Structure 1
Amino acid sequence: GVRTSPTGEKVTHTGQVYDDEDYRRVRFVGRQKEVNENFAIDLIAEQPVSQVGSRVISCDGGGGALGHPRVYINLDKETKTGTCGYCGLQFRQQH
């Protein structure tokens, strides 16, 4: 989900791009700007929300020791989903 500025230079996920009057664009003349197009926010926004049947849940990122430290998420709010702090997965109580 990359976005291009009116000058033709792409914008990274951090929002960095060069202005039209910036002299630092000359480093890209005759070469190319290395920008990663797999924006992580869009890919984590497409994960389905996991419906569980407990007040609390545990997340480890999948894979056990190959993931993040095991955190515990509370699901007492019926308005918002409980998002894991590391992997960004969101869980939701079915009641």
Structure 2
Amino acid sequence: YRKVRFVGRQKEVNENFAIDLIAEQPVSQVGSRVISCDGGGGALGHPRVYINLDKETKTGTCGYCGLQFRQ
């Protein structure tokens, strides 16, 4: 129905997607209990948060951090 508003307008659309780009990361490992995540660098990026990694070797990308974190 809506398909008439762009005829001769070429539909400028995004190319890359961050729907799944976490999955191509080399999922980190430590072998400890609780780790800081000031990822992206200090005083920028997502705030400090502490995660328990005991259970199916992972963390869960911290929500904030996004990068797959595990052991």
Q: 1:52-84 deviations in whole A, cap 9, x for unaligned? A: 121111212221112111111110113544322
What's the RMSD between the two structures over aligned residues?
A: 1.9
Identity of aligned residues (%): 97
Taking CA–CA contacts closer than 8 Å with sequence separation of 6 or more, which of the two structures ends up with the larger relative contact order?
Answer: 2
Which ranges in structure 2 are unaligned for 5 or more consecutive residues?
A: none
Higher-Rg member (1/2):
1
The alignment of Structure 1 onto Structure 2 pairs a total of residues equal to: 71
Task: Flag as ranges the 4+ runs of structure 1 deviating above 6 A.
Answer: none
* More helix by percentage: 1
Q: TM-score, normalised by structure 2?
A: 0.79
User: In terms of mean alpha carbon deviation, does 79-88 or 59-68 score higher?
Assistant: 79-88
TM normalised by structure 1 equals: 0.62
Question: What residue ranges of structure 1 are gaps of 5+ in the alignment?
Answer: 1-22
